[PDB]
Amino acid sequence: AVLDLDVRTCLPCGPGGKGRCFGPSICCGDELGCFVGTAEALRCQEENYLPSPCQSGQKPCGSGGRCAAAGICCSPDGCEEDPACDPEAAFS
């Protein structure tokens, strides 16, 4: 996804920075599954100070949103395992 503005690369998530923020108290590590307000999701607590829309990894999908975590097509309300991307999907 094209860069947002001057301060790209949003706040990672999970271990080190495998994941990142996605919407509401949520996080989705593509190579790091998805956590909504979970332990590996709290990384977004730091996003409460910097709203700055930063680069995301939401590759659209017909699963009511865009791809995200281990094959996860997230929406404005929450994420779900998208067969189109990796879990409920093929042996991806």
Q: Which CATH number does the domain housing residue 10 bear?
A: 2.60.9.10
Write down the residue that tokens 């999907």 correspond to: 89
CB-CB contact of 68 with 57 (8 Å): yes
Experimental method: NMR
- Look at the chain and report how many structural domains it folds into: 1
For residue 25, the enclosing domain spans 1-92
- Return the number of other C-beta atoms located less than 10 Å from residue 83's C-beta: 15
The answer to whether 58 touches 68, Cβ cutoff 8 Å, is yes
Burial 44-68 (b: 16+ CB within 10 A, else e): beebeeeeeebebbbeebebebbbb
Q: Is 64 left (phi over 0), alpha (psi -120 to 50) or beta?
A: left
Contact 7, 42 (CB under 8 A): no
Element (H, E) at 74: strand 73-74
Residues of the chain by 3-state class (helix, strand, coil), percent to 5: 10, 25, 65
Element (H, E) at 20: strand 19-20
